[PDB]
Design a protein around this ligand. Structure first.
Ligand SMILES: NC(=O)c1ccc[n+]([C@@H]2O[C@H](COP(=O)([O-])OP(=O)(O)OC[C@H]3O[C@@H](n4cnc5c(N)ncnc54)[C@H](OP(=O)(O)O)[C@@H]3O)[C@@H](O)[C@H]2O)c1
Ligand SMILES: NC(=O)c1ccc[n+]([C@@H]2O[C@H](COP(=O)([O-])OP(=O)(O)OC[C@H]3O[C@@H](n4cnc5c(N)ncnc54)[C@H](OP(=O)(O)O)[C@@H]3O)[C@@H](O)[C@H]2O)c1
Ligand SMILES: O=C(/C=C/c1ccc(O)c(O)c1)OCCc1ccccc1
Ligand SMILES: O=C(/C=C/c1ccc(O)c(O)c1)OCCc1ccccc1
Lengths: 315, 303
């Protein structure tokens, strides 16, 4: 249940989302990541931003050491945070991630966002008025430094996240390009199905990896609370009844059948184990059209401040 | 049951109107707002002018503290009064409102009226500068969304065409009901992705200060009454429903517990296309608010 990436590596099509808000004790990431592996997840998505790489790594090490899985059976993703886009900062950020996870390589290193931020200690640097401070970086040079991380064997594959088509073409058309992005990890779900971007990515052999596939964690910092709750969608609910599954399983399955690699976060043991059931059934072509029909150009993540970033992807 | 605004925020389509005349003690605002939340209202409309923001806010805070609702479940609107249009006065007026209601932010801040008043003495203010100060309030996170009220099309175009515009108004809150359905203004607002929010949707409170005393009583309309029978509802419900099926966000003021609880039933039924046309037929260009003291104001929206 993998897809062949454009660099020859393989990516499991269902991935485990590890981000949880800061009110959740950090110890939980260790427990839940073990649960996810035990359930059948082999693809695991983390980032420097998440502040959980040590716990996630410990989980992966645990299930390797106890013999459940081998390191080569696990696909582990980390991400370069936006304060580290300047090319001289790229390799040391990856090396810092690896040391935290206590892993030797990542299967995938992503540029987390095209929205560069001022270099420094703070993840979210701000000024006197409390506004986030942007930075300006040529992302082609960031990409070159990523290419070097791959040649150095620190990342098996490299790709991007939150890029639009124009931003992807920039990399694709870069003079002297060594490696295409293997993927673009973007918000993708039946309310924002990204069909155009997906067709583009497919035409270039770039895998679209969907986050907030279950409608996001609806974090107050980024998501309007009165936006529609994806999993309450009547069409999703009716297909769940029809198939004897759940709305989450429908939303996940949808992605798999359109060629999308899908992430699912859960910190609940029973939902974790439910989500791996995604491979047990299939949606019909008409089921898929009905889900396609839910598209409404709704991205759950919003930021007044980041909408003004020159590299904002929804501009 | 929300509509997506042009800044990405969501607004519940049925809102609770809080204004009551000064003869009504403010303690009632506190009680009736609690009743409204208890009934299912989540969108609550107040203003500086209403002299009730403390009571309305205390109601909201109370239902949050007792665990009925969360702050994020509540969509709270306030308004910038006309004596505060000068741009340096905008943010402190919002800040004063926030402190009265004891809220961190308002979900919506409106310019109440285009008829500026001296900080009745008129004032002359470039409302584009007022709007810029509103944008800065939104960027400061004091207001999730910003919009206007009682603007006509020309006044809306002035904001829309402002050089350097950062945020369109999300809405224009205007008098709107089957005797004055505003179809032309609504089509304009729709064409610009601006939500029309209807006040006096039930035919106004018929305040002796502002209403023609022999103006027809909306809720007594024979067509409204016939549709209420047909659907086994009430004329108020028909009026509210009418607005919801034409894309309009509707307010409804009631300080009576039973009527408050009645009004939330608006989501239980639907009018047919022909029912809608019959209600469209009722338009008689009737304004329940008469202000011809205000007719000479350069910004009077009905000039
Ligand atoms: N590149 C980026 O910028 C970016 C942005 C956002 C997310 N991500 C990644 O993508 C991952 C997933 O996206 P997301 O965090 O937005 O969450 P998500 O996968 O859309 O949604 C998971 C939400 O749905 C719930 N859930 C999971 N399984 C369910 C089921 N079977 N039935 C009902 N509810 C269920 C979970 O709550 P419980 O935990 O209570 O089960 C969870 O909070 C993140 O953790 C992160 O790894 C990346
Ligand atoms: N932006 C502006 O310039 C502006 C202007 C006017 C109003 N507004 C806002 O819009 C709100 C509503 O407008 P409005 O004040 O003109 O009042 P309205 O919503 O038209 O209601 C008028 C009267 O209808 C009665 N009513 C309510 N529900 C009923 C039902 N189910 N059956 C029978 N009667 C019912 C109420 O009496 P009881 O109280 O006895 O039920 C109320 O006094 C105001 O409170 C204010 O928030 C804004
Ligand atoms: O860049 C970001 C991304 C946030 C984030 C949150 C949770 C995650 O699991 C994750 O991978 C990333 O944060 C700022 C939020 C934002 C929202 C909308 C548009 C622009 C920026
Ligand atoms: O412009 C007005 C009334 C506007 C009005 C009424 C009800 C509303 O729901 C609303 O939004 C607007 O008349 C003068 C107001 C006044 C006079 C003396 C003392 C205090 C207040």
């Amino acid at each position: 249940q993998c897809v062949k990436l454009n660099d020859g590596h393989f990516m499991p099509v269902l991935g485990f989302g590890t981000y949880a808000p800061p009110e959740v004790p950090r110890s939980k990431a260790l427990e839940v990541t073990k649960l996810a592996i035990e359930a059948g997840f082999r693809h695991i998505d983390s980032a420097h931003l998440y502040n959980n790489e040590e716990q996630v790594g410990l989980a992966i090490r645990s299930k390797i050491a106890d013999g459940s899985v081998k390191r080569e059976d696990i696909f582990y993703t980390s991400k370069l945070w936006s304060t580290f886009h300047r090319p001289e900062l790229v390799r040391p950020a990856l090396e810092n991630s690896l040391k935290k996870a206590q892993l030797d390589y990542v299967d995938l290193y992503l540029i987390h966002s095209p929205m560069s931020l001022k270099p420094g200690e703070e993840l979210s640097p701000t000024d006197e008025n409390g506004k986030v401070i942007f930075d300006i970086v040529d992302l082609c040079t960031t990409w070159e430094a990523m290419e070097k991380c791959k040649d150095a064997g620190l990342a098996k594959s490299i790709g991007v996240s939150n890029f639009n088509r124009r931003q992807l073409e920039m990399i694709l058309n870069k003079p002297g390009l060594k490696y295409k992005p293997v993927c673009n990890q973007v918000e993708c779900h039946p309310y924002f199905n990204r069909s155009k971007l997906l067709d583009f990515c497919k035409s270039k052999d770039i895998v679209l990896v969907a986050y907030s596939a279950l409608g996001s964690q609806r974090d107050k910092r980024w998501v309007d609370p009165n936006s529609p709750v994806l999993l309450e969608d009547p069409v999703l609910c009716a297909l769940a009844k029809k198939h004897k599954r759940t709305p989450a399983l429908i939303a996940l399955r949808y992605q798999l059948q359109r060629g999308v690699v899908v992430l699912a976060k859960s910190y609940n043991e029973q939902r974790i184990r439910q989500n791996v059931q995604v491979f047990e059934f299939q949606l019909t072509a008409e089921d898929m059209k009905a889900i396609d029909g839910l598209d409404r150009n709704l991205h759950y993540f919003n930021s007044d401040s980041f909408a003004s970033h020159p590299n904002y992807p929804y501009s």
